[PDB]
Symmetry: C3
Subunit: 462 residues, 3 copies
Amino acid sequence: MNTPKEEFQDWPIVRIAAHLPDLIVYGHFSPERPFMDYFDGVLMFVDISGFTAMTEKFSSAMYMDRGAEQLVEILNYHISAIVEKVLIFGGDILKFAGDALLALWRVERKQLKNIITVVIKCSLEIHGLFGLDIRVKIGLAAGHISMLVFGDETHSHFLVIGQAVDDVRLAQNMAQMNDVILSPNCWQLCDRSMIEIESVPDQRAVKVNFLKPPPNFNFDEFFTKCTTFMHYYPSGEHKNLLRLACTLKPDPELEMSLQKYVMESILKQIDNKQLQGYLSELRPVTIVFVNLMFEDQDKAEEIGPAIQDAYMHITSVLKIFQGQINKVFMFDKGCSFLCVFGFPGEKVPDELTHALECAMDIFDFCSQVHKIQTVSIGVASGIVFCGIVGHTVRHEYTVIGQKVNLAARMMMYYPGIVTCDSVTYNGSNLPAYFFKELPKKVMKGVADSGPLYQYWGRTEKV
Amino acid sequence: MNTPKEEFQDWPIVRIAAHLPDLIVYGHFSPERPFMDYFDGVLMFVDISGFTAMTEKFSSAMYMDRGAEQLVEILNYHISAIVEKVLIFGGDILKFAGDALLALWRVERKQLKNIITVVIKCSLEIHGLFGLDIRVKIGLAAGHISMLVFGDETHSHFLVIGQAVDDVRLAQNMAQMNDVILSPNCWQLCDRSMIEIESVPDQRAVKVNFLKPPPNFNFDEFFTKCTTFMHYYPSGEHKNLLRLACTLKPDPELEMSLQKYVMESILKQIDNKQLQGYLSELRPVTIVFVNLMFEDQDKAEEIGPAIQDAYMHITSVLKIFQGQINKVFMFDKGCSFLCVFGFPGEKVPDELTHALECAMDIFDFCSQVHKIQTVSIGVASGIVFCGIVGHTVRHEYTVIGQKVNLAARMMMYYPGIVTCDSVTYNGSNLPAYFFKELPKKVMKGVADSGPLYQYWGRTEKV
Amino acid sequence: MNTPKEEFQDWPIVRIAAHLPDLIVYGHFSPERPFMDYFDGVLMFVDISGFTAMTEKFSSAMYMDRGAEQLVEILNYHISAIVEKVLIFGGDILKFAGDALLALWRVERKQLKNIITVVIKCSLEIHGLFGLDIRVKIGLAAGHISMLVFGDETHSHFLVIGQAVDDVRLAQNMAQMNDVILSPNCWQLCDRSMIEIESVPDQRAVKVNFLKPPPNFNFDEFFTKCTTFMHYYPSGEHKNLLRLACTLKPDPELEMSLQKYVMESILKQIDNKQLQGYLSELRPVTIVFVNLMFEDQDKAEEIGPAIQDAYMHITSVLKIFQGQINKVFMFDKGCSFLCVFGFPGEKVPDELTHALECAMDIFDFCSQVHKIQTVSIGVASGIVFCGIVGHTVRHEYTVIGQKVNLAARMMMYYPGIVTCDSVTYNGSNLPAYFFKELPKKVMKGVADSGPLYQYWGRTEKV
Ligand SMILES: Nc1ncnc2c1ncn2[C@@H]1O[C@@H]2COP(=O)(O)O[C@H]2[C@H]1O
Ligand SMILES: Nc1ncnc2c1ncn2[C@@H]1O[C@@H]2COP(=O)(O)O[C@H]2[C@H]1O
Ligand SMILES: Nc1ncnc2c1ncn2[C@@H]1O[C@@H]2COP(=O)(O)O[C@H]2[C@H]1O
Ligand SMILES: Nc1ncnc2c1ncn2[C@@H]1O[C@@H]2COP(=O)(O)O[C@H]2[C@H]1O
Ligand SMILES: Nc1ncnc2c1ncn2[C@@H]1O[C@@H]2COP(=O)(O)O[C@H]2[C@H]1O
Ligand SMILES: Nc1ncnc2c1ncn2[C@@H]1O[C@@H]2COP(=O)(O)O[C@H]2[C@H]1O
Ligand SMILES: [Cl-]
Ligand SMILES: [Cl-]
Ligand SMILES: [Cl-]
Ligand SMILES: [Mg+2]
Ligand SMILES: [Mg+2]
Ligand SMILES: [Mg+2]
C-alpha cells in the first residue's frame, strides 16, 4: 500500500492566517468588544529607513509604469528576510506599518531575562543582513503588555498598549542607523553578564554594543532551552515550517472569527476572485491620520471603552464618505487610526471633499467621547504605495509614502485641530474661507510640506 | 552533466483527467454512441449525511457573504481525505453526486472475494476518519457491472448499470450512521472466514461488524497480492502518486476525447481563462430532475439506445431553454438526469418559466421513446451550492442543496407527471390554471416542501 | 533553532529572465544604441518541421474551439524537452522563432574544438527524442559571432550577426529530416578523430554520421572538463537547476534593463494583472515581414547603425498603425523584422489597410537609409497561432502559421517591393489600382498562395 506525497494544503483559512499574528490566530478569546488581555513579553520594533524616498522615485519615468511592481518586489525581498529571522528566533510578528514592523516574544515573567538575550541576538543578525541606501533601526522593550481587541459584528482590530509599547517606539526613534536600542526596563531586566552596552546621552535607554557569551556558552543549546517556553514554536514533524499557522485546518468558526480582521479586497484575492496584481499599486489617495489622546495612554481598562466608542463612529462615517481604516496603533500619546480614501475599488472624484468632511465629523464626535482628551487629524493627498508587504507566511496590506508621513507629522505638530496639505486644499470643492492658512513648522522628517491649512469648517468660529 | 529537478508538469490533459475516472481516462473505447462495456467488480457508495443542512446555514449572515467559500473548503477537507483512502486502497472514483461518491474496484471474477476484503478494510478506515454534525454511510456491492457511454459529437456522459449498481444504493439507504452494509451478493461472494457480520431485519443485506484476520494474516502482504490484479495502481517510480493519471502526457487525440466529458465552464478554468473563485457559489437556481423508468433497468443493451435517444432530445431543448445537465445516473428504477438552470454564465430572468417549459417538452418527448415506460420530472428552485468537490487529483463539479433533494423526492413520490415547488410556481410567468395544486405527501428526507404543484401545461386535459 | 524550508522564490525579475538568454541577462553592457559585442562560439539551429501544418488543422471543428490550447500544449511538450537538453549540455537559448530555436555555446577560441563535440552529442540526443508527423532538423556552425543591441529608451532588441550565423541557417536548410549538418568552418574546427561525417553533394557542409569515441573516452569526464569554460553552468548547491537565472534576486536596475526586451502584454501577465490563458490564441492577424538587405551582412559595425536607424522609424510607424515587432533576426541576406497587426489588445477593423499603409511607409523610409541596399516587404493575413513557446525556465512569445511562412517567402521571392496576399488585398479598403497583380512563382515551402499583389501605392509610377 502506497504512502503517497501529501501536498502542502493552502486552504483559505491558512491564507487568512498569514495576515495575522499567533496572538490572534491562536488566541481563542471572547467575541465581546472591547476585550482586553494582559501578559508580559519582549517587543521588537524594526524600521527600514529610506523606502519612503524610494517610493517617490518609483513613480518616475525610468520605471516605465511598473513602479509599484518593482517597489513591492524589492521591499518584500528585504522585509521577507527580516521576517524569516524573527520567526526562526521564535517571535510573533504583530503588525506591519509601512516599512516597519513590530514583533513580540510573549513569555512568563521569569523567562524575560533569557528571552531578551534571544531577541538581542536576533536583532544583531538582522543588522547583519543590511542600492546602498536603506538602514535598519531597532528598538527593544520588555515588561507588562496589554492587548485590546475592538470592533463590531463583522470587523475586528487589535492593538497592544502600555509602557513597554511606548518604550519600544521611543527606543527605535533614538536609534541611529543600524543601532539596536534597549528601553530602560529592558536593560534593567536583561542578562547583564552577556550584554554589553553603551550609554546614550540624555537618555536612560542604552545601545547594544555586542554579546559577550561566557566560557561554556552554546547559543543553540540556550535557544533550545528557551523554546520550552514558546507555545507555538514549530517542532518535531513540523520543524521545517516557519509558522505552526501553516498547518491550520479548515474550521468554519475559527475562519469566521479570523476573517473579520482582514479587508474585503484581500479576502477577494484569497478567494481567487480577483488577480493578485491588482492590489500592488502606486495611486493618488488621501490619508486621514486621526489621533486620540488620553490622560493615561498605558491603562487599557480606561482607554479600551473609549477606543471602541470612537471606532464605532469612525467606521460608520468612513463608510458614508468612502474611506477605510488601514491601521490602528498606539502613537502620539494616543491611539492613532490610519485611514485612507481612494484604496482598490473605493475611487470617486470629490474624494478630497469627502476626506475633509469625514475628518471634521470624526473630530466633532470623538472630542465628546469620555476620556478622550484631544483629537488631532492630519489630512494629506498624493501618490502612495499600497500593497501586501512581508513574507509569504506572514504579510499584511499596508501604505507607504511621503504623504503618509506628512499626515502623521501634521497630526502631531498641530494638535487639537484638523489640518490639510496644499493638494487637499486646492483640490477640494470647499470654499476657501472654510480654511485657515497656518504658520509653517519645521517638522521632523519632512523637508517641505508646501503651505498647510486648518480645516476650520462651515459655521464661523472667529 | 547535471540531472536537474524535473518539476511536476500540470498539463491541461492532466487537469482534465482529474475530472474523470480511470474507467474513462484509460478506456480507449469506440466513439460510437451508445457504447456498452461489461465487467465485474466491487462498488462502494459513500455518503456524508448533513452537508445539505450545512448548506442552508452557510447562506446566513454569520458567514459574511463567504458562505460558498467556507462550504467548499470544509466539504473538500473531508471529502479529500475519503478520496485519498479510496485511491490508496486501489479504487477508481467514478462519480461525485453532491456530498456522496461512488467508487469501483474492477477485477476478474476470481479476484472478487479477495478484493471485497480490501474494500471492507478501506470502508472501515473511512468510518474511522469521521462540527460534531456529519456522519458517513457506506454501501458495498459486488458482481456484474455494465457501463454505458452516450452522447453526441461534442459531449459524452457515462454511467454504470445493473444489479450491483442497484444494490449498492439500496445497501447505502439502509445504512444507519457509520454503518457499512454489504449487498446480499457481496456477502455471498466475500471471505466469510474474515468478515464478521450482523443480520439486518427484513433484509438479506448485512452489516459489517468487524474484520477477523486469521493467525498468519498480514494485511500489507495480502494487499500487495491484490495489487497484481490492479491495472493502474501507482507503483515503482510512481509509487508516491495518488493516481497514474497524474503522469498523463499531452496527446491531442486523447484530450479531444476526454474533454467532451467536462463542462465548458470548467475547461475555461483549466485553460486559465477565468479565475478559480468564480465556480464556487451559493446561488439561486432551478433544478429539473428527470427520471426515465424502464421495464428492466439492469439490461444495458435494452436501455442504452433509449437513454441515448432521450439524451439527444434533452441536450437540445436544455440548450434552447438555457439549462445544463449536471449529472446522470441510475436511480428511482431508472436513469435520472440532474439538470440545472442558472449555472455560472447561464443566468436570465424567466428562468422559472423556461425550466417548466423545458420540463414539459422533455416529458412529452421522452414518454414516446421506445422502452421508456414512465417519465417523471421534479422542478424546484432555491439557493444551492455549486462548485468543484473532491481532491486535487480527483474532483468534479457538483450541486448541493435542500432544493436538489426536494426535486429528486418529488420526481420519486409523484411519478408519471411534471411537478414543481412553490417558489417555481409563484415565480413563473405562467397562468395559474396551467398548474394543479397537489396532495401533500410525507417524503423521506424533507421536513416541509411548502405547497407542491403539478405543471399540467397549456391545453386542458380535465 | 530551526532551519526551515526555503521555498523557490518566483520574483518578477526571474520571470522576466525566462524570456531572455544568459547573453542578455548576465551581459551588463552599455545602454548606448547601437551596441556591438564580438566573441566566438558554436551555434545550433534546431527546427521542428510540421507544426505549421498542425496549426492549420487545430482550427478545425474537431478541436472544439480549444485549438490554441491543444497546440501550445503539444508544442511545448516537445520544445521543452529540446530546451532541457540544450540547457543540460551547457547551451544558452538565444531565441525562439515559431517552431525553431537558436542556441549558443560561447567560448574562447581554443575551446571551440572540444565544445563542438559537446554540441554534436547534444544534437544527436535531440534527434533521439523525435502523431508520427514532425521531424527535427539541426544545423551547427562555429566561429566568430557579433551581437548587436538596438532600441530606444524603453525598448531593446538584440540579434547575432556574421558568417557563422549565416552558416547555421544554410546548414539547417540542407538538413533532410533528422540530419545534423555542420557548416564548413565547424567541420574544419571540430575533433576529426571523433566525429564521423558524410559529404553532402554540391556542398562543403557535412552531415554527422556518428560519434566515434576513442578507447579511453568517458563523455561525462570530458563534459566536466568543458564546464570549466562555461561561465553560468549551474553547479554546486545550484546543480539541480536548469538555469543560474532561476537564482536571480530582485535588483531594480537590472530589472529596468531586462524588461525593455519583453512585450507589455507579457509583463502584464508576469505582474498577475491578466490571466495566462489570454495569450495563447489562434486568431486572424496580418503579418508584415520586412527585409533590409546590406552589401555586407556580416559586418556589424557597418550594419548596426543602419538597423538602429531603421528600427527607430519602424517602431514609430508601427505604433501609429497599431502593429508590433514580434521578432528580429538575420535572414534573406539581411535583417528581417517580423511585425504583427492584431496581437492581444491591438485589434481594429481596417487592420489590413493599416498594415499596407505602414508597410509602404517603412518601405519608403528604409530605402533611403544609408547602407540599406534593398527593402522587401511581404504582407499576408490569416489565422495564426500566437503564444508563449518553450520551457518554464526559458520561453518566448512567438507566432506560428502558414501565413507567417507565406509572408517571409513573398519578401524573399519578390525583392525590392511591397507584396500582399489575396486576403489582404480583398479585405483592404484601398482602391484596386493601388495594386498590381503579379506573376505566380513556385515558392519553396508553399503549396498555393492564391493570387499575389504588389502594393504599388497612391501616386501612379507607370
Ligand atoms: N504605513 C504606515 N503605517 C503606519 N504609520 C506610518 C506609515 N507610514 C508612516 N507612518 C508613521 O509616520 C510616522 C513619522 O514619524 P515617526 O517616524 O515618529 O512614526 C512614523 C509612523 O508612526
Ligand atoms: N553588561 C554590562 N554590565 C556592567 N557594565 C556595563 C555592561 N555593558 C556596559 N557596561 C558599562 O556601562 C557603562 C555605561 O556608560 P559607558 O557607555 O560610558 O560605558 C559602559 C560600560 O563601561
Ligand atoms: N448533487 C446531487 N447529485 C445527484 N443526486 C443528488 C444530489 N443531491 C441529492 N441527490 C439525490 O437526492 C436523493 C434524495 O434521496 P436518496 O437519498 O434516496 O438519493 C439522493 C440522491 O440520488
Ligand atoms: N463470517 C461469518 N461466518 C459465519 N457466520 C457469521 C459470520 N459473521 C456473522 N455470522 C453469524 O451470522 C449471524 C446472522 O445473524 P446474527 O447477526 O443474529 O449473528 C450472526 C453471526 O452469528
Ligand atoms: N514565428 C516565426 N518567426 C520567425 N520566422 C519565421 C516564423 N515562421 C516562419 N518563419 C520564417 O519562415 C521562413 C520560411 O523559409 P525558411 O524556412 O528559409 O526560414 C523560415 C523562417 O525564417
Ligand atoms: N572524422 C573523419 N576524419 C577523416 N575522414 C572522415 C571523417 N569522417 C568521414 N570521413 C571520410 O570523409 C569522406 C568524405 O566523403 P564520403 O562521405 O564519401 O566518406 C567520408 C569518409 O570516408
Ligand atoms: Cl499594535
Ligand atoms: Cl454512474
Ligand atoms: Cl538572433
Ligand atoms: Mg519607516
Ligand atoms: Mg447526501
Ligand atoms: Mg519551422
